[PDB]
Each structure stands twice: as C-alpha cells, then as structure tokens.
Subunit: 221 residues, 2 copies
C-alpha cells in the first residue's frame, strides 16, 4: 500500500493501547502489518501490546522483528531496552540503550542517557551510572528525576555540597516520594536546615506513614 | 612511580617494533612490561595486536579481553578490539564493543570508532544505518578519503548522484584509487557526462587492474 495508511493505522492502534484496550489495538496494528510487513513501528507497537498482556516471549519477538528493519529505531531501541530492563535482562537492556543513544535527532535522547545510568546502577556500576546521568543533564539540565539520581549518588559518596546542588535542582520539579523526602531530610540536616528537615519529615510522616523511610527518619530524627 | 616508568617505556619499545614491521620482536619488550605489571591494559592491548598481526585470533582475543578486564571502558582498546572482531566477521560482538567505545567523547580517534560502526553496519545489511555512522565519522574528521568513498558508494547506489559525486571528489583528492573506486568514478562520470574522466579512469583500470572483475564490467560498458 503506502506509508500514510500504515501510519494512520499505527496511531489508531496506539490510541487504543495508550488507553488500556490492547486486544483491540491489535486489529489496526495488524492492518498496518498487512500493508508493510517490515514496519518497525507496527512491530514495536505490537511488542508493547503483548508486553502489556504479560506475554514476554511474544513481545521480545516483535521487538526483534522491528529491529531487523534498516530504519531509525532509537525510540524502538529505547522501549525494547525498557522491556529488557523489567525482564531483568540488564546487559541486553544496556546494549539496546547504547544503540538508541546514537540518534542525536531523537527528542528523548536525554531520557535514553538517564536509562543508561539506571541500568548501570542495577549492574552495580555506579561510576559509569554517574557519567550517564551527567551526560543526560548536559543535554538538558532541567530533568528532576536525573538530578535526584545524581544527588543520591553524591550523597552516598559523602560529597554533600555537590549532592545538595543536585537535590535543590530536583526539588524545583516539586515531585517528592518516600525516597526523595528522606534524602532531602538527610541533606537538610548536614546543612543544618531544621526547617526543611522538619517540613519534609511531615510530608513523609503524612504521605508515607508506613514506609521504611519514615522509620529511618524517626530513628535519625 | 618508577616501576610504571619502566613498564611504559617497554610498552613504547614494543609498539615501535610493531610499527617498524618487526612483529615477532615486539613480544620481548611487552612481556617485560607485563612481568612488571601483570594487569597493564596497554601491554595486553599491544600484545593483542602482535597476535592479531600474526593471524593468531585466539591469542589476540584473549589479550584483548585481558586488556579490557582492567578497564572495560577504554575507548582506544575497545575500538582496536571491535576492529579485530570485524576482521574476524564477529559483527554482533564488534558492534557491541564499538557502541561502548563511542561513549568516550574525548577519545581523539572517536571518528574511527564511528567509521567502524559504519563498516560493521554494512556487513549487517543496514546501508542506511551505515550511512549515518559514516556521516558522524566525517563530521569529527573531514579528512578521511576512505570514509568519503564509502559515502560515495552508498549515495551512488541510492541514485543520489550529486551528493555521491561530491563525496567521491573528496575521496579522489586524497590520493589512492583501486579497481573498486575507479569503476565507481567511471560510472559517476557517465552520469555527469564527463567523457574525459570516464575514459581516463577506464585506462588506469585496464592498465593496473586488467584482471579485476571491475575491469571486466567496465568493458561491458557498465
């Protein structure tokens, strides 16, 4: 057929998937595949469908089919990498992410670098992780989640001043959690900021009354 | 610290023998470096090319791996190893080592890393991907006739004659020419109705590569 039709069908499938209906999304995706059996995007969309229907082996197959095409696959590589990650296939996830990072035109390139840092952490390679988080920030400094990873790593290495800078950077994204609040409390205390320590503690004591962090906060309080 | 001074010196002596073509002699100095520092990545790496040069792939592979055990992210060694893997036709592994090599953006020869990613892509039957890698290599180092030639060939095959010709001319102003490139230049001249070069290249080709498949095709007025 033609790319327009194929692409129209692919988005139809996505729209359905991007809203829970996966058994359905499959009909427009398969139409896309009838038009272009090699469509990397059609196969990738299908991979995410099976991935959603907790069918790992089917998802892996679709992802590999999409990678077989000689097209710009950074997005596909990044999603496959995420998939390999939850499948605990870390070394593989890392390789696909390295390949996804090659595309400088890809809008999510800095997220690809964040993912490289994340996977490096799972592999117990903190030093390369830091490097990857730093590369992500060099592309775009305003990514709270990445700054949080930097703050956490620097904090564990006792490099408190740089850690605080990154934590402050993360804090202006206003997206706390048990982990971020506890890191905030601990940093606040190194810099003797009782106001922040007390404040975050409440958000913790209130938003995550049960969490281990709350316990630690209580014990370090 | 003194021990590192002698080790480094021996590694340089070894690389000098290699560079001078005395491949086998390079081993003496390199084993000394290794006797001083059993885990020296640069000594293992140099020994690796000694073996690679002597067509002893098992030994070369083992030395490349020992060199990377030390520092698994050393771009120079990752690139030499991926280059080795490419020659051994172990494309998946070459690609993987080269992808890791590409991450050191301060590596002076990063342009070579991208050239290698492009060549490996060719063998994986992904010419559009090879092209992107080749363009990255030329952006980092414009003066690479061999990369310009691979670009010219790809563009020619894509019917993108003007960009093809452009890259070809850049390759030509670099010296070399072989059966392959003479034929490519001949076919490009024909497209841009340049009878002079077409007849001239066909000359160098009949003269220097009379037994090549390229000359055979040329005669078929190809």
């Amino acid at each position: 057929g033609r790319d327009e039709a194929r692409d129209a069908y692919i988005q139809l499938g996505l729209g359905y998937l991007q809203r829970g209906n996966t058994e359905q999304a499959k009909v427009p995706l398969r139409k896309a595949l009838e038009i272009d059996p090699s469509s990397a995007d059609a196969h990738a969309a299908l991979a995410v469908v099976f991935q959603t229907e907790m069918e790992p082996k089917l998802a892996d197959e679709e992802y590999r089919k999409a990678l077989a095409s000689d097209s710009r696959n950074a997005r596909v590589l990044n999603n496959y990498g995420g998939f390999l990650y939850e499948q605990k296939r870390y070394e593989e996830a890392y390789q696909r992410l390295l390949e996804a990072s090659q595309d400088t035109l890809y809008p999510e390139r800095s997220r690809v670098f964040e993912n490289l840092g994340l996977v490096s952490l799972q592999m117990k390679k903190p030093a390369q992780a830091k490097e990857y988080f730093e590369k992500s920030l060099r592309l775009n400094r305003n990514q709270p989640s990445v700054a949080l990873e930097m703050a956490d790593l620097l904090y564990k290495e006792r490099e408190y001043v740089p850690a605080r800078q990154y934590y402050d950077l993360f804090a202006q994204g206003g997206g706390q959690n048990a982990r971020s609040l506890l890191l905030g409390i601990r940093l606040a205390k190194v810099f003797e900021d009782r106001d922040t320590a007390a404040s975050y503690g409440l958000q913790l004591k209130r938003l995550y009354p049960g969490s281990l962090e709350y316990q630690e906060f209580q014990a370090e309080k």
